[PDB]
Amino acid sequence: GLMQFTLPVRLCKEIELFHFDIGPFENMWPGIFVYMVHRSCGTSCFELEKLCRFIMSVKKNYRRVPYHNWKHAVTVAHCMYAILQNNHTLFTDLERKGLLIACLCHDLDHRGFSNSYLQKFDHPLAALYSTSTMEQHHFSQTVSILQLEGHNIFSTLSSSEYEQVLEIIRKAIIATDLALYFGNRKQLEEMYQTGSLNLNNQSHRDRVIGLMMTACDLCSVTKLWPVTKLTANDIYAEFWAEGDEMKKLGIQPIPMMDRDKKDEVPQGQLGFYNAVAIPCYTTLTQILPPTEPLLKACRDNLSQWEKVIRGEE
């Protein structure tokens, strides 16, 4: 009730910045998350006992894969926190509650494989969920954990507030399917420019929350260069394992997933910043001016990938 979470001074300060790294101390990650909910949402959003038990069940249902792990979940939630704190007055009480939870839960029980590989392997999830296969799974795992005895952190919301929050979380999690992102950003691009973007239109909020989700999910490209470069090693460690598995099914993987194209990583990173990252943070900054530090950090890391291609590092 009177029990604030504090962080050591360097974290207490650096956690407010977009580029904050949550560090290698796994055991501090829960407290970092609780700290961020408490400042973002207030100390009264969740019963602490329930929140702690929910965080620990979420943790247990992330797998020890090189990239889509518990560290990624808490990274994507810290970026959402940064966005929320810098756009204080644009979001509802329920949106602040829901989105930090959505981000912690967005990759629950990920196996290190793309929706594509699940479809070619003919994994059972691919017959339960024909598109956004893993993302429909992540949402389903969220609801499961919320239904555990003692884990309903939303148990004080009205019957209809509860339904609104689970609907924000579902759309938020589905929007992390990067196949949906391209169309979502194109439509936001058009509506912003033609002046039709309206934050009272619920379907517009949805789009804008979807772009925030993609921005948070891609936030490794917005870190200090050494964080960005070492996270790319984890990202390709999964992709290349998937490439291996594709070759086991008799299928040439795409170059992104072929470890025989190690040499081309720098140029693949350029494609990705140009096709995906920069456009994402550009459109995000237009709609939400105070997120510009994500665009500016992303541009910095593109320029570092340019330097790598030129032998300069």
Ligand SMILES: CCc1ncc(C)c2nc(CCc3nc(N4CCCC4)nn3C)nn12
């Ligand atoms: C959400 C996906 C994602 N989030 C963050 C990051 C940093 C990220 N990087 C990549 C791979 C990008 C890429 N690599 C290649 N290569 C490598 C050598 C030949 C082809 N092609 N492409 C397009 N995805 N990704």
Ligand SMILES: [Mg+2]
């Ligand atoms: Mg995902």
Ligand SMILES: [Zn+2]
């Ligand atoms: Zn993710």
